[PDB]
Amino acid sequence: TTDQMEMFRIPVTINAPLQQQVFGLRLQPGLDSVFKHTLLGEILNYYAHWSGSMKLTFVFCGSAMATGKFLIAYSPPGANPPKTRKDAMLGTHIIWDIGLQSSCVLCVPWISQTHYRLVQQDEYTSAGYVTCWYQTGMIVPPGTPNSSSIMCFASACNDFSVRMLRDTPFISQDNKLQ
Amino acid sequence: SDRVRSITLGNSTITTQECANVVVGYGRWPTYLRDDEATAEDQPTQPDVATCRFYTLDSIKWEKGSVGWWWKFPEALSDMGLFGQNMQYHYLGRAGYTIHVQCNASKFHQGCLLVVCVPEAEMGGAVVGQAFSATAMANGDKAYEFTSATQSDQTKVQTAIHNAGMGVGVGNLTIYPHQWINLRTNNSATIVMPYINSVPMDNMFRHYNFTLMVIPFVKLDYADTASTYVPITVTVAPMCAEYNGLRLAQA
Amino acid sequence: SDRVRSITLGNSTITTQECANVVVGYGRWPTYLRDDEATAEDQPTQPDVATCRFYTLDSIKWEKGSVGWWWKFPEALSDMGLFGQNMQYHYLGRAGYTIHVQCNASKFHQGCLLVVCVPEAEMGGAVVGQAFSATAMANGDKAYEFTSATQSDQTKVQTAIHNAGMGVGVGNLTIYPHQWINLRTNNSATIVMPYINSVPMDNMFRHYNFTLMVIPFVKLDYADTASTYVPITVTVAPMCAEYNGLRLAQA
Amino acid sequence: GDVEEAIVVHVADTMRSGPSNSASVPALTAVETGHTSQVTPSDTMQTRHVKNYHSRSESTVENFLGRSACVYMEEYKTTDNDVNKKFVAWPINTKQMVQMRRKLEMFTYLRFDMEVTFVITSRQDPGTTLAQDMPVLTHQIMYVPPGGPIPAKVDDYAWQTSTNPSIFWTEGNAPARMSIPFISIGNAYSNFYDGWSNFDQRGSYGYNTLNNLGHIYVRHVSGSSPHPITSTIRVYFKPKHTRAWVPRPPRLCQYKKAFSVDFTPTPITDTRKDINTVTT
Amino acid sequence: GDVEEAIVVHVADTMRSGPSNSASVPALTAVETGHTSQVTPSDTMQTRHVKNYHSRSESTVENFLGRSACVYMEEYKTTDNDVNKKFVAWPINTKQMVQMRRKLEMFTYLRFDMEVTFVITSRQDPGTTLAQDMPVLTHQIMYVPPGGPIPAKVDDYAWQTSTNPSIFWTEGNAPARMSIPFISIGNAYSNFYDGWSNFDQRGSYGYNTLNNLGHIYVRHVSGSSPHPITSTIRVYFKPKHTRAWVPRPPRLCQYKKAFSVDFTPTPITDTRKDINTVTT
Amino acid sequence: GAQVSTQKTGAHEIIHYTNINYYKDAASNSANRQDFTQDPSKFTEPVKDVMIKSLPALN
Amino acid sequence: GAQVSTQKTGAHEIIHYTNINYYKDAASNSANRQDFTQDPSKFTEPVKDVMIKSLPALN
Ligand SMILES: CN1CCN(Cc2ccc(NCc3cccc(F)c3)cc2)CC1
Ligand SMILES: CN1CCN(Cc2ccc(NCc3cccc(F)c3)cc2)CC1
C-alpha cells in the first residue's frame, strides 16, 4: 500500500467468479494487526483478559444504482479455516442485501469454553475466523464506475468487559524527553 | 414499509430489502407430527438448531439464452451439514422447508422468472419406452438445465421446456405454490412448503418429496453495460425436522 | 434378588444376571448444564436418543500373561455412530457416560480385575525429556497394553504397570471410582461418570476427559479345560450429551 | 449510633430467542446518522438464557488512573566542584514520562487530587580511596509555588522554608508520602490547549502556556562526605477522586518533545501478505 | 449493636456392646461393589462406652495447605559485565519446588486466594579490596501480566511501571507481603491437563499449556557499588480460602522435569526377609 | 465516624470493612473506587430523534 | 464491624476474640480456618442402592 488511506477500503468488482472471497481475517481483537490500533484494540491492550460479544458493521459506498448480495460468516475455532463459501456458510452467517439501508451488522456471539480470553491470544484461547463471500455478485447499469469499496466498523456489545490491568507495549522511549 | 423482510433460523439469518411477501404452502405452516397420526413406535430424534438452518446451494449464471433449471429435494441437501448425516443414518425422515431464491439486477435490466415448487414431479424419459438411471435428474446440489429443442439422448429425461418434462402446459404451473421475480419491483422469492405426502414419514433417499423449478418467461435483456450475466442463488432451510429408525449409515 | 440389573438407553438395552450394584461417580448423576453456569450464548443442540445409547468397543483376549489395558475417552468413541459426527461438526461438547465391562467365566476359573475411571490421566514419556505424538496413547477404539518391564522405546509412553504411567502406586488407584470383577461372584462392572472438568464445556478432540483402565491384580488361572482365553468386552453410553459451536466438520 | 452502614452492577444478561420471520430488520441500519447500532446477538440468531455475573469494576476511570507511576528522576551529589550539580530543580509537569503521558492524554480535561511519593537511594561513587565512615544521610524536599524565591546554591538562605512546605527524610525508613488537593486556577486541568499566549495570536503555543504549577528542589541537609556520594530521587504520582471529560483517541506516533505535540508520520498498522491471508 | 457475635465437632463416640448371637453378619461384606465397609469395633467385640473429645480440626484442607512454602530463589548482582546477570526474570509456576509441588498435586482442581511474601538478603562478593562504604540498598519487584512489555536491561524504560503493580523495599525492614485474588480464566486452577494445544492433537502437551500467569522481575533500584554485591530473593506462597476437588493418589516417583510428568519406574515399597518376618 | 460497607467479592459463592478518617482535609481520604455507575448513551446515541432498533433507520 | 467469635480451646477443662477488616477486598481477609464440616460419603458410599451394614452385601 503506497497510499496509507487505501488500508481502509475493501475493493469490489463487477465481474467475478460465481463464488469468490472478498476478505478474511482472524478474530484476535488485541493481537491481530487489523484490530491492533483500532479504538477497541487500544483499550484492550491496557488489559490482559476480555470477554463478551463484538459487532462488525459493514457499509457499502458504491453508486446508488449498484446492487448486490454478500455472505458474511463467522467460523468458531477449528483445525482449518474455511476455503470456500460451501464450507463458510456452515457456521454463523448473515446474508446482506444492499438497498436503501446501506449498513448491515454482524454480531459475533461469545462462544468459548472459558469465561475469559487472553489478550495475548494463543492456540489454547483461539477465537475463530471471519470471512466474506459473493452471494450473487455486483451488477451496475451503463455509465457507472466498474469498482466500488466497502468499509468495516468494530465495536463492543453491552456485555463486554475487561480485567487485569497492565502496561501497553505500543509506546516506548529510549531517553528522557526534553 | 412492507418491502423489508428478515428470517432467522438456527444460527443463520437472511435479510432482504426489496421483496414481496411470503407464500406459505397451501396455507399450512410446518409442524411436528402428532401423537394420533404417528405409526412408528420408538422415540424420534429432533435435532433442532443443528439441522434447521439455511444452506446456500451453488450459484448459476443467467444468460440471454438460458431456458431454465430444476432441483430435486431432499437429494439436493443429501450431502449438506448434519442434515445429510441424519439422512444417512436414519430410515425415516420428515421436515418442511423454506426456500429463498435471490436475483438482483440494476433498474436498466428486464426479465421475469417463475419460481415454483412441484410436489411429486414425476418425469418421463427422452425416448418413450427406455429408462434412465438416477443420475439424469439428481446428482447432488448441481442444477439440471432444460432445453429449448426436443431431447434426443435416450439416457436422460425429456427436457422440452414448454412441456416441463411432465407432459403438461408450462403456463399452467401457476396452480402450485409459486412466486415471480420481476426485475422491475422484486429481487427475491420466499416459499414455505409443509411436509406433503401420503404417509406420515418416508425414506429421504428413495423418494423425492418435491421439485424446485426456475423458468425464465421473459428472457433477460440489457444494453451496453459491463455486466455480462446475472447470478442466481438458492438458499434452503429445513423446518421442524425429525428422524427415526437408526440403522447403520450408508443410505 | 439384587443380583439382576437392567439398563435401557435409547434403542438399546443391557441385561446382566450376576452383578454387583452400580457405582455413581462421586455421588452425582449426569445432568444438563444450568442457565446460571453456562457461558456460550447461542442455543445448544441436544441430540437425545440419537446419541445417548450403548456402543460396543472391540473385544480383547485375557491370557495368563496379560498385564492390563487402557482406553482414552471420548477419543475412543470419536468415530462411532452419530456421536462421532456431532463431535466432528461442533466446537464444544459436554456429556456424562455409563461404562459397562463384561467378563464371564465358569466356576472353575479364578482371577480378579480392577475397573477404574481416572480423570485427567496425564502420562509421561518413556524417555524423560523426549516427547510423543498423539498416537502412543490414543488411536481410536483400539486398546493399548501395559508392560511388565520398563519401557525403552522413546516414541511411546512409559508402560510400567506398577506405576500405571502416572508415577503413582498402582495399588492406590482405589481412590477413583472403581469396581472389581471377581470371577467367584461377579461378571460385570458398571460405573456412571458425571462430566468432570474445570470449565462448563470443552473441545472433545483436544482434551481427554478421563481414562479407563483394566488391570489384572490376580492373574487368570485354570486347569485342563478346552477354553484357552477369556474375552473382555467394554460398552459405553453417553448421557445428557449436548453440543455447541457449529463450524465446518473435520475436527 | 456510632456506626453508619453506608454499605453491584453486572453486565446485561442474554435472553432466550426463537425462530423469527417478520418485517422488522434489526440487523439493517445506517451509520450515516452517526449512531452506533445497539443490536445484540439475540436479534440475529437463536440464543439460550444466560445469566452474566461479570462486572466492569476494573474499567472505571478511578481504577484505570489509580496507579502510582514514575514521572521524573534526577541525580545530585553530596559534594562536587560544580555548584549546580549538588541539588535538583524540576519544573513540575506530567509530560516527561511516556507511559503516564499517554495514559493521561486519553482525556481532554481532568480534575483530581494527587498523592505524591518519593523514593530516594544513594550509592558511593567509584574512586581509589573508598575507606570511610559516614553516618546516615538526610534529605530535604522543598516545593516552591510560582513566583517564590529560588535557591541558587546548596547552602542558600531560601532553604529556611517559613511558608513553603517541605519534607525532611532520613535514609532507611519508609518512602515519604503526601497529598495535594486540586490546585488549578481553572475548573479542570487541560492536557491540550489549542491557542496562543498573546492576544494577537503570537508567542508560546500549546499546553506549555498553562503550566504554572511551580518547582521542586532537593538537597542533602548537611551531608558532605570526604568522598563523593551520589543520590537519586524518583517521583511518583497517583491521581485520586478522578473525573474526566471529552475522551480522545490514543496517540499513535512516538513522543519526541516534552512540551510539544511534534511527531513523525507513522503507518496506520502492520501489513500482511494479502487480504485473504489468515494463517500465521 | 456494633458487635456481631458470629461465634465443635468431635469424632464419633463408642457405644457399649454385649454378647450377640444372631443371623446378622456385619463383618462379612463384598468389596466388589466398590463400597468401603462402615463397620466399627463395636460390631465385632464387646466394648465399653467411651466419649471421644478428639477433633479433626488440623486435617482440613484449609489448614493442610495454609502454610507458606518456598517456590523459587535466584541471585542477581548489583554490578557486573553481563547485562542478563544483574536482574531476574521468572515465569510464575508452582512446579519448581518438590515439597510444595507434591502437596498441591494431591488434588486435581484448586481455587484459592494467594498470599505472597518476599525474603531478600545481600552479601559482599569475595575479592582483594573489600574496604568500602555503601548506604542501605533498595529493591524493586515488578509483576508483568502476560503480553506486557518485558525489560531487557537493569535501566530499561519498562521499570517506570504505570499500570503494572510493583513493590519498593529497603533492607533492614520486615519482609514484603501482598495478596492476590483468584486470577484464573477458568473456574479453577488445574494441576493436571490431559490434552494438547492444537485442535489436531499436536503441539504442547500437558499442564504447560495452561500456564499463563505472567512474569516477575527484580532489580536493584539504583545501587551500583564500586565492588560487586550479590543479592538473593526467595518467594513464598500461602493459599487462602482454599477449595479442592477430585483427590488423587500421592506421587511415588521422584520428580525430574519442571514442566512434565516424566519419571523413572520405582519399586512399590521396600522388602523384608519373608512374609512371616516381624522382628526388627 | 465508623463507616461500614461491603467489600468486593464473588458471585453466588462477613464481607464488611470499617473505615475511619483521621485528617481534616477531604483530599487525604482514600480512593473512592467503589462506584460502578455508567451510561454510554452520550457517545453511542447522540442523535436528536430517538431511533428504534427494530424499525428501519431511515424512512 | 466488630466480629466476636470463640477461639479454639480444650475439652471439659473468656475464650473470645475480636476481628475487624481494614481493606476493601475480600482477598485481604485472614484465613477462615474455623470450618470443620465434612462428609466422607461421596468417596466411601458411591453406590446407587443403599447398603445396610447388618444385612448381607449380596442377596
Ligand atoms: C498543562 N496542564 C498541566 C497539568 N497537567 C496535569 C497535572 C499533572 C501533575 C500535577 N501535579 C500537581 C502537584 C501535586 C503535588 C505537588 C506538586 F508540586 C504539584 C498537576 C496537574 C495537565 C497539563
Ligand atoms: C497450570 N496451573 C497453573 C497454576 N498452578 C497453581 C497456581 C500456582 C501459583 C499461582 N500464583 C498466582 C499468582 C499470585 C500472586 C502473584 C502472581 F504473580 C501470581 C497460581 C496458580 C496450577 C497449575
Ligand SMILES: CCCCCCCCCCCCCC(=O)O
Ligand atoms: C484522630 C482520630 C483517632 C481515632 C482513633 C481510633 C478510633 C477510636 C474511637 C473508636 C471509634 C469510634 C469513632 C466514632 O465515634 O466515629
Ligand SMILES: CCCCCCCCCCCCCC(=O)O
Ligand atoms: C480502616 C478501619 C480502621 C479501624 C480502626 C479501629 C476500630 C475503631 C472503631 C472501633 C471499632 C468499631 C468498628 C465498628 O463499628 O464495626
